[model samples]
Target: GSDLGKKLLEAARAGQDDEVRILMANGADVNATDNDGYTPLHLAASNGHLEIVEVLLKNGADVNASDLTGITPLHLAAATGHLEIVEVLLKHGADVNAYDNDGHTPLHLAAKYGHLEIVEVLLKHGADVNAQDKFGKTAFDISIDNGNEDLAEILQ
Candidate 1:
């Protein structure tokens, strides 16, 4: 039998909640991972599919599952500055301080992407602003490298 997991993942990427429901009802594993290790939750998060994310989480998806790049849904949400999504994930017990394979935490993603609002939310949720990536670059370092003076000021 052909794997229907990819189809469910595609439905998530397309934000077709109806199709996702159909796939799930037809026995698709909610936590199926792709070659890059991205589960449906990852794509939904990266795409900012709030409803889809909610559906997945309600179905018992792992909010902290990292892709092959070690980037979690929280990382993607933070990078894109999705404040409500960040809050939802945090409330669902997503690891606020999870470091990816490169050791870059959600804070790193927020800082690299210049998401000051997300950075603040992360800090308020106990994210270490000083956590470093694999390259030993903290959020502050990324802000300086990206010439984000406003973020640099906030970080200080």
Candidate 2:
């Protein structure tokens, strides 16, 4: 990645909508990844930057782009409890059940992190409550183990 590429990634992470737009207009790759394969969309979504995510998505960012760990923007948003970002990604066609390298889905992260609203949205969007990870742990299992009793009850 060039300096501009790095700049674009940083700007997206920082929620700098103007910088992201300018960088995109200047030909910065919307799907460019950093050392860990995190695209601009991933950064924006992970940080709950709605405007940056919107700009990147409008400019052709891959909604399902994954990092080396198979962590998509959806995964980051769900894990970080960014409900609006999760909604934006879903609106853009992000796979609700897309799993990471660990076989953990967005629902798993949301439940484990105790994001009740995110878990609800994901379920409404067709996330499999019974989906399990590589460790054979479902979102319900994670919620229970993580002491998220309220979320666990909801999952149940």
Candidate 3:
């Protein structure tokens, strides 16, 4: 990674919106991945940094970029309960059903964490609700385990 690219990642992860803007303007690779393959978009999504996420997306960051776990920006945001950013990435062409190392898809994270709003939003975006994880656990299956009955009801 370029010095500026790494810095862009730091800014993106830390939620420094202005620093990210400066880095982007100076030509930092918005998609510059870390040693683990986590791109700026991944960091921002996991950290729930909305403005940074918006900046990166508007600048053409890769929406479906994967990390060591094959986790995408959409997955991270969904897991962390960041509703707006999930929708934001969906708007930016996030791969709705990207499968990860655990056979967990973006939609899987929402049910596991028991996110009501997120599950609905993902469903509206055409998530494959019946898809299962490595253990063959569907979103509905995991939702029951987490006692996510609110989501399980809708999923059912």
Candidate 4:
């Protein structure tokens, strides 16, 4: 990885908005990926750094860039209960129904975490409630298993 790119990834992970801006201004790649293919956007989203996420997106970071596990920034944000990040990613054209290598979509993650609001947001963006994961469980099933009756009902 390029030095600037690596620094950007770290800054994103650390939520150093200042360094993130500095690196980008110095020509760091907005979509820089680490060995696992986790881009700066991926780190930022997973870490819940909305500013860095927005900076990367505005600079043309690939919203749908999937890692080795077929996980996008949207997947990380959704799985980690970052509702605002999830909304911003969706606004930036994230695939609402994007599935991981294991076939778990954003909805599946949201439901698993019992985040009813994220579930609704993904649904509003066309998430497939009936989409099944590699474990053969739909988001609704996941919600039920997680004891999230509200999420399950919404998913239903």
Candidate 5:
């Protein structure tokens, strides 16, 4: 990654609003990806940087952009339980049912990690509660398997 790309990713990860703004203003690539295919939006969303997320989105970042493993910004936000980010992504037209390389939807990851709020947000945005992963396990099944009875109930 170039210095600017690294700086953009770092500023995004650290939630430095001013630096992000300055970088973007100076022509930093909003969609630049790291070696792992993780873009600035991916870092911002994954780290719950709400301001950065908005800035990136306003600058035309790909809402459904994925990393090497097909982990979208929505997937990162959901997995990390960032409800606001998830909502923002959805509002920006993120695919609520997008599956990763393993066919695990954001819902599957949220269920496995017991992120109740994220699960609800995903569900509200029309996530398929019964969507299955490559292993043939639905988010409901994952919740049960992970001993998250409350989440399982919600899924059920």
Candidate 6:
């Protein structure tokens, strides 16, 4: 039981298509999470593994699966400036408004990280640009706090 889950996780982390296929064929749970509550799909998505993400989704992975941080694959992609991954996750039904543990949405993370493209995509897909976090900070405020003048200008 444990072996398969560990193998599955490793395969995802390594982007090993063949190994993942073998594991899945042998009855590995596609949604098996690690100790951190991160499923294979989470790792794949966070690492910008487009093919792996598609394969996992086809194999019954949960696109909106949240980790201990209340962050989904969308949040990871957006936070890391992975625009293509962000778009793919959104197209596959990732929630734009899903807030993390800190009450920051994917848009908030994108803005804070200064990913203008990801921020634009998320906003286009319905992320609440004006939504405030627990600290009473909006994406604009986050950008300003980080001295992201370009993003702050865009937000304004």
* Model 4 CA deviation exceeding 4 Å by range: none
Each candidate structure's count of clashing pairs: 0, 0, 0, 0, 0, 0
Per-candidate TM equals 0.92, 0.97, 0.98, 0.97, 0.96, 0.93
Q: What C-alpha lDDT, on a 0 to 100 scale, does residue 38 get in candidate 3?
A: 94
Candidate 4 residues 1-156, lDDT tens each? 669989999999999999999999999988888999999999999999999899899999999999999999999999999999999999999999998999999999989998889999999889887899999999999998999999988777
Using TM-score as the yardstick, the better of models 2 and 5 is: 2
Instruction: Report residue 118 deviation for candidate 2 (angstroms).
Output: 0.2
Question: What's model 5's lDDT at 84?
Answer: 93
Instruction: Give one digit per residue, the lDDT tens place, for model 6 in 51-154.
Output: 87878888888999999989888888888788898988888889999988999899899999999988888888988878999999999999989878798887
User: Compared with the true structure, what per-residue lDDT tens digits does model 5 show for residues 42-78?
Assistant: 9999999999999999998999998999999999998
TM-score of 2: 0.97
Q: What is the lDDT of residue 143 in candidate 5?
A: 94
Candidate 6, clashing residue pairs? none
Q: What TM-score does model 4 achieve against the real structure? A: 0.97
Whole-model alpha-carbon lDDT for candidate 5: 0.92
Q: How much lDDT does each candidate structure score? A: 0.86, 0.93, 0.92, 0.92, 0.92, 0.86
Taking all chains together, the TM-score of candidate 3 against the true structure is: 0.98
Give the lDDT of residue 45 in candidate 5: 96
Model 2, residue 55: displacement in angstroms? 1.0
Model 2, range 33-86, lDDT digits (tens) per residue? 898999989998998899999888888999999899999999999999999999
lDDT of 1: 0.86
Q: Residues 1-156, candidate 3, lDDT per residue (tens digit)?
A: 779999998999999988999888998999998988999999999999998999898889999998998899999999999999999999999998999999998778999998899999999999999999999899999999999999999999
